[PDB]
Amino acid sequence: GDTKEQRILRYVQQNAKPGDPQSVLEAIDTYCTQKEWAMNVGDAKGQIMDAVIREYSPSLVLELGAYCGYSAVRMARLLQPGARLLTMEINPDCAAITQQMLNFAGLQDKVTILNGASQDLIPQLKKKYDVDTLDMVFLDHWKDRYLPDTLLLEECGLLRKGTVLLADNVIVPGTPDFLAYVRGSSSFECTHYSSYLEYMKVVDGLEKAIYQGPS
Numbered sequence: 001g002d003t004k005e006q007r008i009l010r011y012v013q014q015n016a017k018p019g020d021p022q023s024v025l026e027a028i029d030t031y032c033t034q035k036e037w038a039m040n041v042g043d044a045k046g047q048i049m050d051a052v053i054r055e056y057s058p059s060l061v062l063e064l065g066a067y068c069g070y071s072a073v074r075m076a077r078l079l080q081p082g083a084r085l086l087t088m089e090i091n092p093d094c095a096a097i098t099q100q101m102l103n104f105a106g107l108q109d110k111v112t113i114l115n116g117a118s119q120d121l122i123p124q125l126k127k128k129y130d131v132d133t134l135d136m137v138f139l140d141h142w143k144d145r146y147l148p149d150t151l152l153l154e155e156c157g158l159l160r161k162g163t164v165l166l167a168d169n170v171i172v173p174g175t176p177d178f179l180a181y182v183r184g185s186s187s188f189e190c191t192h193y194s195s196y197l198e199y200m201k202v203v204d205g206l207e208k209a210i211y212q213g214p215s
Protein backbone atom coordinates (compact mmCIF):
# COMPACT_ATOMS: atom_id res chain seq x y z
CA GLY A 1 0.00 0.00 0.00
CA ASP A 2 1.20 3.45 -1.03
CA THR A 3 1.75 6.12 1.63
CA LYS A 4 2.49 9.82 1.49
CA GLU A 5 5.94 9.24 2.99
CA GLN A 6 6.75 6.63 0.31
CA ARG A 7 5.57 9.17 -2.29
CA ILE A 8 7.94 11.84 -0.93
CA LEU A 9 10.84 9.39 -1.05
CA ARG A 10 10.00 8.34 -4.64
CA TYR A 11 9.75 11.93 -5.81
CA VAL A 12 13.20 12.65 -4.39
CA GLN A 13 14.74 9.53 -5.96
CA GLN A 14 13.29 10.45 -9.34
CA ASN A 15 14.12 14.17 -9.39
CA ALA A 16 17.02 14.79 -7.03
CA LYS A 17 20.65 13.82 -7.60
CA PRO A 18 22.32 11.04 -5.54
CA GLY A 19 24.98 12.34 -3.16
CA ASP A 20 23.61 15.89 -3.58
CA PRO A 21 21.90 16.92 -0.30
CA GLN A 22 20.87 20.34 -1.64
CA SER A 23 18.91 18.74 -4.50
CA VAL A 24 17.19 16.44 -1.99
CA LEU A 25 16.07 19.45 0.11
CA GLU A 26 14.79 21.23 -3.00
CA ALA A 27 12.89 18.14 -4.13
CA ILE A 28 11.10 17.68 -0.80
CA ASP A 29 10.25 21.39 -0.52
CA THR A 30 8.93 21.30 -4.08
CA TYR A 31 6.89 18.19 -3.38
CA CYS A 32 5.37 19.50 -0.14
CA THR A 33 4.58 22.94 -1.53
CA GLN A 34 3.31 21.90 -4.97
CA LYS A 35 2.21 18.25 -5.05
CA GLU A 36 0.97 17.15 -1.61
CA TRP A 37 1.07 18.74 1.86
CA ALA A 38 3.23 17.00 4.47
CA MET A 39 4.75 17.80 7.86
CA ASN A 40 7.89 19.66 6.81
CA VAL A 41 10.17 22.24 8.37
CA GLY A 42 10.49 23.95 4.97
CA ASP A 43 13.16 26.17 3.47
CA ALA A 44 12.50 29.41 5.41
CA LYS A 45 13.02 27.73 8.77
CA GLY A 46 15.68 25.57 7.15
CA GLN A 47 17.80 28.64 6.53
CA ILE A 48 17.64 29.61 10.20
CA MET A 49 18.71 26.06 11.07
CA ASP A 50 21.58 26.38 8.59
CA ALA A 51 22.68 29.60 10.27
CA VAL A 52 22.67 28.07 13.76
CA ILE A 53 24.72 25.05 12.63
CA ARG A 54 27.27 27.31 10.97
CA GLU A 55 27.48 29.61 13.99
CA TYR A 56 28.12 26.92 16.62
CA SER A 57 29.58 24.18 14.36
CA PRO A 58 28.39 21.38 16.70
CA SER A 59 30.25 18.04 16.72
CA LEU A 60 27.39 16.06 18.29
CA VAL A 61 23.75 16.86 17.42
CA LEU A 62 20.60 15.15 18.69
CA GLU A 63 17.43 15.40 16.58
CA LEU A 64 13.99 14.48 18.03
CA GLY A 65 11.36 13.48 15.44
CA ALA A 66 12.99 12.68 12.08
CA TYR A 67 9.80 11.89 10.07
CA CYS A 68 11.05 11.55 6.44
CA GLY A 69 14.57 12.87 7.00
CA TYR A 70 14.28 16.44 5.72
CA SER A 71 15.82 17.98 8.86
CA ALA A 72 18.39 15.18 9.21
CA VAL A 73 19.54 15.93 5.65
CA ARG A 74 19.41 19.67 6.36
CA MET A 75 21.70 19.42 9.40
CA ALA A 76 23.98 16.47 8.49
CA ARG A 77 25.04 18.14 5.23
CA LEU A 78 26.63 20.99 7.23
CA LEU A 79 28.44 18.74 9.70
CA GLN A 80 32.25 18.39 9.65
CA PRO A 81 34.15 15.12 9.34
CA GLY A 82 33.99 13.30 12.66
CA ALA A 83 30.80 15.13 13.62
CA ARG A 84 27.71 12.98 14.29
CA LEU A 85 23.96 13.40 14.01
CA LEU A 86 21.89 11.17 16.30
CA THR A 87 18.25 11.21 15.26
CA MET A 88 15.27 9.65 17.06
CA GLU A 89 12.10 8.58 15.24
CA ILE A 90 9.26 6.81 17.03
CA ASN A 91 7.62 5.37 13.87
CA PRO A 92 9.34 2.31 12.25
CA ASP A 93 8.12 3.07 8.71
CA CYS A 94 9.32 6.66 8.95
CA ALA A 95 12.64 5.51 10.40
CA ALA A 96 13.05 3.34 7.29
CA ILE A 97 12.15 6.23 4.96
CA THR A 98 14.60 8.50 6.77
CA GLN A 99 17.39 5.94 6.31
CA GLN A 100 16.78 5.65 2.56
CA MET A 101 16.59 9.45 2.28
CA LEU A 102 19.96 9.86 3.98
CA ASN A 103 21.46 7.02 1.94
CA PHE A 104 20.31 8.66 -1.31
CA ALA A 105 21.71 12.05 -0.17
CA GLY A 106 25.11 10.47 0.61
CA LEU A 107 24.98 11.22 4.35
CA GLN A 108 24.28 7.81 5.89
CA ASP A 109 27.72 7.61 7.55
CA LYS A 110 27.20 10.85 9.49
CA VAL A 111 23.86 9.80 10.98
CA THR A 112 22.66 7.22 13.49
CA ILE A 113 18.92 6.58 13.44
CA LEU A 114 17.32 5.43 16.67
CA ASN A 115 13.85 3.88 16.43
CA GLY A 116 11.91 4.46 19.65
CA ALA A 117 10.45 7.03 22.03
CA SER A 118 12.58 9.97 23.19
CA GLN A 119 12.04 9.29 26.88
CA ASP A 120 13.26 5.69 26.50
CA LEU A 121 16.26 6.39 24.28
CA ILE A 122 17.59 9.62 25.85
CA PRO A 123 18.77 7.87 29.06
CA GLN A 124 20.77 5.32 26.94
CA LEU A 125 22.87 7.81 25.03
CA LYS A 126 25.77 7.89 27.50
CA LYS A 127 26.15 4.12 27.88
CA LYS A 128 25.14 2.78 24.47
CA TYR A 129 26.03 5.56 22.03
CA ASP A 130 29.21 6.82 23.69
CA VAL A 131 27.88 10.30 24.30
CA ASP A 132 29.46 12.65 26.83
CA THR A 133 27.47 15.84 26.28
CA LEU A 134 25.47 17.15 23.31
CA ASP A 135 26.48 20.24 21.36
CA MET A 136 23.03 20.81 19.87
CA VAL A 137 19.47 19.50 20.16
CA PHE A 138 16.77 20.01 17.54
CA LEU A 139 13.23 19.44 18.88
CA ASP A 140 10.50 18.69 16.30
CA HIS A 141 8.64 15.67 17.70
CA TRP A 142 5.46 15.68 19.84
CA LYS A 143 4.84 19.16 21.24
CA ASP A 144 3.74 18.03 24.72
CA ARG A 145 7.14 16.32 25.00
CA TYR A 146 9.41 19.36 24.54
CA LEU A 147 9.37 20.41 28.20
CA PRO A 148 9.69 17.00 29.79
CA ASP A 149 12.40 15.79 27.35
CA THR A 150 14.39 19.00 27.99
CA LEU A 151 14.20 18.32 31.74
CA LEU A 152 15.27 14.71 31.14
CA LEU A 153 18.23 15.78 29.00
CA GLU A 154 19.32 18.04 31.82
CA GLU A 155 19.05 15.48 34.58
CA CYS A 156 20.75 12.82 32.43
CA GLY A 157 23.74 15.19 32.27
CA LEU A 158 23.61 15.54 28.46
CA LEU A 159 23.62 19.37 28.41
CA ARG A 160 26.75 21.46 29.00
CA LYS A 161 27.23 25.21 29.19
CA GLY A 162 26.82 26.45 25.64
CA THR A 163 24.66 23.56 24.39
CA VAL A 164 22.14 24.94 21.89
CA LEU A 165 18.49 23.82 21.91
CA LEU A 166 16.50 24.74 18.81
CA ALA A 167 12.77 23.98 18.89
CA ASP A 168 10.24 24.18 16.03
CA ASN A 169 6.53 25.05 16.10
CA VAL A 170 6.70 26.84 19.46
CA ILE A 171 3.96 29.24 18.34
CA VAL A 172 1.88 27.10 15.95
CA PRO A 173 0.39 24.89 17.28
CA GLY A 174 2.49 26.13 20.21
CA THR A 175 4.54 24.94 23.18
CA PRO A 176 3.85 27.59 25.82
CA ASP A 177 4.86 25.36 28.77
CA PHE A 178 8.29 24.80 27.23
CA LEU A 179 8.55 28.50 26.37
CA ALA A 180 7.60 29.65 29.87
CA TYR A 181 10.14 27.34 31.49
CA VAL A 182 13.19 28.11 29.31
CA ARG A 183 12.56 31.86 29.04
CA GLY A 184 11.96 32.09 32.78
CA SER A 185 14.81 29.83 33.89
CA SER A 186 18.28 31.25 34.44
CA SER A 187 19.60 27.97 33.01
CA PHE A 188 18.60 29.05 29.50
CA GLU A 189 19.43 32.08 27.39
CA CYS A 190 16.60 32.40 24.88
CA THR A 191 15.91 34.01 21.52
CA HIS A 192 12.96 33.73 19.15
CA TYR A 193 13.10 33.38 15.37
CA SER A 194 9.78 34.17 13.68
CA SER A 195 8.91 32.57 10.34
CA TYR A 196 5.75 32.61 8.23
CA LEU A 197 3.86 29.40 7.47
CA GLU A 198 2.87 30.53 3.98
CA TYR A 199 0.35 27.74 3.31
CA MET A 200 -1.44 28.46 6.60
CA LYS A 201 -1.04 32.25 6.37
CA VAL A 202 0.00 32.53 10.02
CA VAL A 203 3.30 33.27 11.72
CA ASP A 204 5.12 30.53 13.61
CA GLY A 205 8.58 30.55 15.18
CA LEU A 206 11.61 28.63 16.34
CA GLU A 207 12.99 29.10 19.85
CA LYS A 208 16.72 28.97 20.49
CA ALA A 209 17.65 28.19 24.09
CA ILE A 210 21.32 28.11 25.06
CA TYR A 211 22.00 26.04 28.18
CA GLN A 212 23.85 28.03 30.85
CA GLY A 213 24.51 25.32 33.42
CA PRO A 214 22.41 23.99 36.31
CA SER A 215 20.59 26.46 38.57
Ligand SMILES: Cc1nc(C)c(-c2cc(C(C)(C)c3ccccc3)n[nH]2)s1
Pocket residue numbers: 064065066067088089090091094116117118119140141142145
Ligand atom coordinates in the same frame (compact mmCIF):
# COMPACT_ATOMS: atom_id res chain seq x y z
C1 LIG B 1 7.64 10.65 22.54
C2 LIG B 1 8.20 10.73 21.17
N1 LIG B 1 9.57 10.39 20.91
C3 LIG B 1 9.87 10.57 19.39
C4 LIG B 1 11.20 10.31 18.77
C5 LIG B 1 8.62 11.01 18.77
C6 LIG B 1 8.44 11.27 17.29
C7 LIG B 1 7.41 12.00 16.72
C8 LIG B 1 7.59 11.96 15.35
C9 LIG B 1 6.71 12.61 14.31
C10 LIG B 1 7.25 12.32 12.96
C11 LIG B 1 6.67 14.11 14.52
C12 LIG B 1 5.35 11.93 14.50
C13 LIG B 1 5.34 10.55 14.69
C14 LIG B 1 4.15 9.86 14.89
C15 LIG B 1 2.94 10.55 14.90
C16 LIG B 1 2.94 11.92 14.72
C17 LIG B 1 4.13 12.62 14.53
N2 LIG B 1 8.68 11.19 15.10
N3 LIG B 1 9.22 10.75 16.31
S1 LIG B 1 7.49 11.15 19.82
Ligand code: NA
Pocket residue numbers: 040041140168169
Ligand atom coordinates in the same frame (compact mmCIF):
# COMPACT_ATOMS: atom_id res chain seq x y z
NA1 NA C 1 7.83 20.94 12.63
Ligand code: NA
Pocket residue numbers: 182183184185186187188189190
Ligand atom coordinates in the same frame (compact mmCIF):
# COMPACT_ATOMS: atom_id res chain seq x y z
NA1 NA D 1 15.90 32.01 30.36
